[PDB]
């Protein structure tokens, strides 16, 4: 894609917006659908986010390869664990409600 970098920049913002929209959605319509939407958006937004950080702060072909590899693992496992929490346990929305009861 000759327009890769700008298509990424646009997706990043599309996702940030997406996630903003999920906050009200979690409060007003909690349940599976939002629970998975949040698992996917929290991971995607955080993965791109931590990647801009590596990009600004990590230098050298190898240290960059390493940071990005470690990030891809952190993210894959993070989206996995969140889907897991949603399938086998109460799920993000309900967990927040419960924690807010303490």
């Amino acid at each position: 894609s000759s327009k890769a970098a700008s298509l990424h920049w646009t997706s990043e913002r599309a996702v940030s917006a997406l996630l903003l929209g999920l906050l009200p959605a979690a409060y007003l319509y909690p349940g599976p659908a939002v629970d998975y939407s949040l698992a996917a958006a929290l991971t995607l937004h955080g993965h791109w986010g931590l990647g801009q950080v590596i990009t600004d702060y990590v230098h050298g072909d190898t240290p960059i390869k390493v940071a990005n590899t470690g990030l891809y693992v952190l993210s894959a496992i993070t989206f996995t664990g969140l889907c897991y929490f949603n399938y086998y346990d109460v799920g993000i929305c309900k967990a927040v409600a419960m924690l807010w009861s303490i």
Binding site: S16, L20, G46, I77, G81, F85, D89, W100, I102
Partner: protein, 139 residues
């Protein structure tokens, strides 16, 4: 003539092997509120992500489920002040980052760039953060 790339390669080549010092930056530079809020936005984003990661790791690795830990904590019937404190601490970064995040999306549409508007939006972000955070730590 030297092309721009050649000029760039010799600059690095000359200087990295020179004995020239690198002038100070971050240790001498004057802060501003916008600058401070900027790096706080990055710091809250990283913290929020690390938190979401730690929580998903606990989901894959701890022996009990969420309801047991909630109950455990409750069985300590902790003081309301402390509870409030903690909820406030939890929601503040999320809060700060969401509102300043909205300010960044507004900048992405090209609006609010006069420097005096940058100072205004930052302060509107701080007060909404504080308000929404006291609001929520109270629910």
């Amino acid at each position: 003539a030297t092309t721009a790339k050649e000029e760039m390669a010799r600059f690095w080549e000359k200087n990295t092997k020179s004995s020239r010092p690198l002038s100070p930056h971050i240790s001498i530079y004057k802060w501003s509120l916008p600058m401070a809020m900027s790096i706080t936005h990055r710091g809250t984003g990283v913290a929020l992500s690390l938190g979401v990661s730690l929580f998903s790791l606990a989901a894959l690795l701890l022996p009990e489920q969420f309801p047991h830990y909630v109950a455990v904590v409750k069985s300590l019937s902790l003081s309301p002040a402390l509870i409030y404190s903690a909820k406030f601490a939890l929601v503040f970064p999320l809060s700060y980052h969401t509102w300043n995040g909205i300010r960044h999306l507004v900048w992405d549409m090209g609006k609010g760039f006069k420097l005096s508007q940058v100072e205004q939006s930052g302060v509107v972000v701080l007060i909404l953060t504080l308000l929404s955070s006291a609001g929520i730590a109270a629910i």
